[PDB]
């Protein structure tokens, strides 16, 4: 896979996304029943989610478009939520046709302060597809290669820049070639490929 | 207009080292109560007391830094500090900014702060659309550069009023080899006057690399 | 299929490397039982649904016809994977003896996430026989292969009592490679053993460097 | 010789530390003695742990969370603090950033323990640094407690009103925001005449019953003036 | 949110459950005063939009600084108008015009999605 | 020659109205991994620096053999097409810090100026030849220039430093 121009951003997406950048708003209610809301919007969501705990509530209203870019799902999103917290953390959540994406939730001697310090370990110490890798753009570069031929020709291939730095780890990823992998931190090509490669960097 | 802008030392220290424009001048340092008064005697509602919500777009007035309560309807208070300072009232040395954009009256009697000269416009033309200044007053010119201020036809702005004024270039007009030309307040006396002693014995600065100059 | 199928692909990945870095230490080993494919490997070491059982990937290996005339007792090698995902100072006598008694060598462990710190306080208590300790995470991809990587070799200390004779050095006077460095790990190294380099040079076409390892 | 005194600034200061943006204001009296001390209304808690509001007084070891600031002036509920730093009951985002703050302070409910806790030897000297210390332009009198907090009020206000995007940070090089000779020879002239005042102390202080020497405000002068340095 | 103070003291108000009968409460760490939840919202947190009409006294006809525009408001049709953009300081922000009438007030835009 | 070129900059100047028009409208999409407003740059300096290239490439084909800065400049003594540019047909835009001419003055170049102008004429753009600025091009200009002889006059010992320690 070289000019595979869609195999580009299968990589990309594949190289972190945080609960943080979905999430429009969050906000925390008081609603004691266990089988319906003091929230309108809301209702249908509890009913179609007992077929095929704490009274303190906990929302968060996701973005639709910001679903789309970093490409993600209810099903996942929470999937992941659930089992990060796992049996002491009962969790819903309404399904991608919607017109309003939520995600409810309870705990399970002062709850206020609890539900408030799991705000945050929600939104910056959970992950949902690495780190220190931010922004990744793609690019089409001049690659000069063997005809089968003979004669070198013009043979561009896609190639994957970042904006940040781990080595060790975004180099056994399915899909890329850690025979060529390169970061200007030759500090950290030389930890990893041993003083010379460090040294040719 | 304050400073030069060619004129500084290469090298070392570059930059660091200003020369003054030819119009440029600095403030001395005026007294504050004889305006502190003028003021809380013409709409200023002092700070001691206030109230929020009764006032709410009220807009804060500050003199030399400090805050001396607000001000209903300032609209007037302005346009009367600015007809005092022309008749000479309130010494031409002294800053008036009103930022509408924020709601705050800025008080400047401070000492350093450079100051240059600019015409007046003022629409005031009940026979058209005008520099308050006449060639009526220039060919008249005991006609010093005092009256030219103490009439209202020239004001010091300094730095930080010069933020909410609007300049005109050439007085009058705001061929194939010219250079192509592209609510005003104030016009410039004459724009080679941004220039300091060194760039004005220049001949045609207008026509060089900058950095020569 | 989960996000399981990928544990797999990468334990076999890690594997293959070991075996490579085996036959590049001084090791009997065939170009196939390097490829093994993903495929003819599952039906081998798994058990019912389709999880890989360690404990029986673990195995032994020896001096080729040829290592045994260059360097004479080199022993054999010893290679081992574990199922428990932190394993522990106890899970290590296991290891710990099984070498000390059979009279190897070279022991070889493959922590899955990491060994305990009361265990691997236990390494060097066996000489002559000396053991190593790799992370998996660390040789799913064999590093040697990297383009920057040029190819390093070991020497007798017959090869090298020559270098130093043959440039008039005094063992200090060479160019060095850290103990801890990801080459060094890879072949084996040992304090006071020598390294032939040889790259590729736009200058020359072939450079020959040599680092001794402090 | 040419940044102006007594002004607001606000700057957001880098990801690797304990604070997220901080308020300044430079002060000195414009006309005598003229100290160089600032204020410091900085802002803990990165932009994610769970954010308190603390500022810097002269001569204080440690800094001192905001509310009791207020309350060691003269202004001791809630809400009549808040009353200060907002002005728009409206604005529930700013409002609730205060609210871990309030929590801080929750513990000083006066004006007894509001200048205590800044360490009846202590308790006076707390007074002190508030009227001669603090924001010391405005005026350093005395009543007018209820100014100087107006204002602390206006900088925690403007401290947020970025804090919450909605103010750059304040432009370093903004021009708009010079020494003359007359003015130099002032802080000269006073740093001299002060040495003349204090030694005319001395021939009044063993005359167990003319002495003005008047040539430190000559040759001081001359010396500066001669090669170019200021002071003395 | 929109939270509340009290009579008697005015201070801050944390929130306590009402247990044998399941309902919120407000209160007071002061003294004792006491009031039931004035709704289930309790804290928002809101990772805007809110500014880009920026304080804009009648006076905004008198800041000379100002454009210049003549187009004609969606309701008094006079050809009097000044603008600029949000003063929302964010770097990611856009770049659309906002309309002041000299013969109104009201704050017709450019924009067109 | 010299009019040909007036109007490759009067052009030029509207394909910048024009994208101002479709700015100040929302009626263009955000190039991954840029702002609305920066891609907004983007163009404007591409469409000036498009313009002012061939502003110069008129003249350059309009001095004959016989031009003698020409002749000095194909023999290799001295100057290049730049120079003949800057000086036969428009100077150039200015810059400081690599973005046209701040906004040092809340939201306008210099008092002579409507706030929120981005236009070029604001931000720093000299429209004339050496031969022929106005009062802001030849501003701009300065501040640009300024940036220049600032690290002539810092990376001029930090660049010795770096060498001495490269010795030693
Ligand atoms: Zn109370
Ligand atoms: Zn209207």
């Known amino acids: 896979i070289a000019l595979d121009i869609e195999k580009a951003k299968v990589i990309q997406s594949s190289i972190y996304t945080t609960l943080k950048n979905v999430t429009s708003a969050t906000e925390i209610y008081y609603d004691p029943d266990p089988t319906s809301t003091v929230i309108e919007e809301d209702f249908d969501t509890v009913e179609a989610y007992f077929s095929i705990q704490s009274p303190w509530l906990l929302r968060l209203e996701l973005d639709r478009a910001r679903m789309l870019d970093k490409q993600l799902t209810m099903n996942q999103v929470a999937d992941k939520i659930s089992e990060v917290f796992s049996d002491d953390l009962f969790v819903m959540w309404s399904e991608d046709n919607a017109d309003k994406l939520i995600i409810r939730c309870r705990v399970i001697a002062e709850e206020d302060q609890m539900l408030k310090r799991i705000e945050a370990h929600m939104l910056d110490l959970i992950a949902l597809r690495i780190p220190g890798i931010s922004k990744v753009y793609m690019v089409k570069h001049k690659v000069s290669v063997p005809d089968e031929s003979g004669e070198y020709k013009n043979e561009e291939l896609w190639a994957l820049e970042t904006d940040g730095i781990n080595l060790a780890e975004v180099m056994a990823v399915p899909g890329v070639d850690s025979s060529r992998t390169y970061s200007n931190s030759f500090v950290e090509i030389l930890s990893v490929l041993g003083i010379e490669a460090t040294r040719s960097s | 207009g304050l400073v030069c802008p060619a004129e500084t030392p290469e090298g070392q220290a570059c930059g660091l080292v200003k020369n003054l424009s030819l119009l440029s001048g600095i403030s001395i340092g005026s007294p504050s109560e004889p305006i502190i008064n003028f003021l809380e005697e013409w709409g200023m509602e002092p ?46 040395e002294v800053s008036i900014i009103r930022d509408i954009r924020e709601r705050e009256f800025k008080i400047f009697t401070d000492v350093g702060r450079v100051y240059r000269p600019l015409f007046i416009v003022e629409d005031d033309e009940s026979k058209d659309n005008e520099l308050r200044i006449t060639k009526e007053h220039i060919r008249k010119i005991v006609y010093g550069w005092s009256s030219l201020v103490t009439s209202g036809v020239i004001e010091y702005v300094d730095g930080e009023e010069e933020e909410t004024i609007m300049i005109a270039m050439t ?28 760039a004005s014995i220049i001949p045609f600065p207008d026509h060089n690399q900058s950095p020569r100059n | 299929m989960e996000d399981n199928n990928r544990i797999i692909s990468r334990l076999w990945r890690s594997f293959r490397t070991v075996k490579e870095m085996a036959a590049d230490r001084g090791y009997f080993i065939s170009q196939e039982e390097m490829d093994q494919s993903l495929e003819e490997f599952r039906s081998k070491i798994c058990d019912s649904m389709g999880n890989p059982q360690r404990k029986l990937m673990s195995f032994l290996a020896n001096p080729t016809p040829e290592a045994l005339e260059k360097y004479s007792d080199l022993g054999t090698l010893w290679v081992e994977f574990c199922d428990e995902p932190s394993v522990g100072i106890k899970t290590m006598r296991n290891f710990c003896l099984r070498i000390q008694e059979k009279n190897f060598s070279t022991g070889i462990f493959i922590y899955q996430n990491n060994i305990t710190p009361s265990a691997n306080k236990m390494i060097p208590t066996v000489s002559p026989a000396i053991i190593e300790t790799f992370q998996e995470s660390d040789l799913v991809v064999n590093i040697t292969h ?18 130093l004779q043959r440039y008039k050095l005094k063992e200090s006077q060479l160019p060095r490679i850290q103990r801890e ?34 | 010789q040419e940044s102006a005194a007594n002004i ?119 007074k002190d640094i508030l009227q001669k210390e603090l924001l010391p332009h405005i005026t350093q009198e005395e009543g007018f407690e209820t100014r100087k907090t107006f204002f602390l009020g206006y900088m925690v206000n403007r401290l947020l009103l970025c804090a919450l995007e909605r103010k750059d940070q304040d432009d370093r090089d903004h021009f708009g925001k010079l020494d003359l000779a007359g003015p130099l020879l002032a802080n000269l002239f006073r740093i001299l005449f002060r040495k003349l005042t204090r030694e005319i102390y001395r021939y009044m202080q063993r005359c167990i019953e003319l002495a003005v ?20 | ?32 005063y006491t009031e039931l939840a004035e709704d289930p919202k309790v804290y928002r947190h809101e990772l805007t939009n809110i500014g880009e009409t920026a304080g804009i006294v009648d006076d905004i006809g008198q800041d000379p600084t100002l454009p210049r525009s003549d187009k004609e408001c969606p309701e008094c049709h006079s050809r009097d108008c000044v603008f600029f953009q949000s003063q929302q300081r964010r770097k990611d922000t856009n770049m659309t015009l906002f309309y002041v009438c000299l013969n109104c007030k009201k704050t017709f835009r450019d924009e067109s999605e | 020659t010299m009019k040909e070129i007036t109007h490759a900059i009067s052009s ?84 400081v810090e690599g973005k046209r001419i701040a906004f040092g003055f809340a939201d306008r170049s210099l008092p002579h100026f409507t706030k929120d102008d981005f236009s070029p004429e604001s931000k720093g753009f000299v429209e004339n030849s050496y031969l022929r600025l106005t009062p802001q091009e030849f501003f701009f200009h300065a501040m640009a220039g300024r940036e220049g002889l600032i690290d002539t006059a810092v990376k001029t010992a930090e660049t010795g430093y770096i060498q001495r320690r490269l010795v030693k």
């Open chain 2, 47 to 92: 700070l001691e007391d206030y109230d929020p919500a009764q006032h709410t777009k009220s807009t804060r007035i500050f003199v030399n830094g400090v805050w001396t309560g607000i001000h209903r309807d300032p609209s007037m208070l302005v346009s009367t500090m600015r007809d005092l300072r022309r008749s000479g009232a309130i010494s031409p």
């Open chain 2, 171 to 198: 007085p009058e007009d705001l061929d194939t080899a010219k250079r192509i030309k592209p609510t005003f307040t104030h016009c410039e006396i004459h724009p080679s006057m941004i220039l300091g002693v060194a």
């Open chain 3, 146 to 163: 990297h383009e920057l990587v040029p190819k390093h070799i070991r020497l007798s200390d017959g090869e090298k009592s020559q270098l």
């Open chain 3, 181 to 214: 460095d990801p080459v060094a790990r890879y072949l084996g190294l040992k304090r006071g053993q020598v390294v032939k380099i040889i790259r590729r040079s736009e200058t020359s076409g072939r450079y020959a460097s040599y680092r001794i390892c402090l």
């Open chain 4, 8 to 126: 607001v600034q606000v700057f957001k200061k880098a990801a690797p530390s304990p604070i997220s943006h901080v308020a300044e204001i430079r002060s000195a009296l414009e006309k005598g003695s003229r100290l160089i001390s600032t204020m410091q209304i900085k802002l803990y808690g990165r932009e994610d742990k769970g954010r308190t509001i603390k500022a810097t007084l002269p001569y204080v070891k440690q800094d001192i969370p905001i509310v009791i600031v207020f309350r060691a002036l003269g202004v001791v509920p809630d809400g009549e603090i808040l009353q200060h730093i907002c002005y728009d009951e409206n604005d529930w985002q700013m409002l609730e950033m205060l609210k871990p703050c309030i929590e801080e302070g929750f513990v000083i409910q006066d004006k007894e323990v509001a200048l205590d806790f800044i360490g009846e030897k202590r308790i006076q000297y707390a």
């Open chain 4, 213 to 232: 020497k008047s040539t430190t405000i000559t040759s001081g002068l001359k010396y500066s003036l001669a090669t170019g340095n200021w002071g003395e």
């Open chain 5, 1 to 32: 949110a929109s939270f509340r103070f009290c009579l008697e003291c005015n201070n801050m108000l944390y929130p306590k459950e009402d247990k044998e009968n399941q309902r919120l409460l407000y209160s007071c760490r002061n003294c004792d």
């Open chain 6, 12 to 95: 030029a100047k509207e394909q910048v109205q024009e994208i101002i028009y479709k700015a100040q409208h929302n009626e263009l999409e955000l190039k991954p991994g840029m702002t609305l407003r920066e891609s907004f740059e983007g163009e404007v300096s591409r469409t000036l620096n498009d313009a002012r290239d061939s502003a110069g490439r008129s003249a350059e084909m309009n001095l004959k053999d016989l031009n003698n800065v020409k002749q000095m400049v194909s023999a290799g003594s001295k100057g290049s097409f730049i120079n003949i540019a800057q000086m036969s047909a428009c100077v150039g835009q200015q810059m």
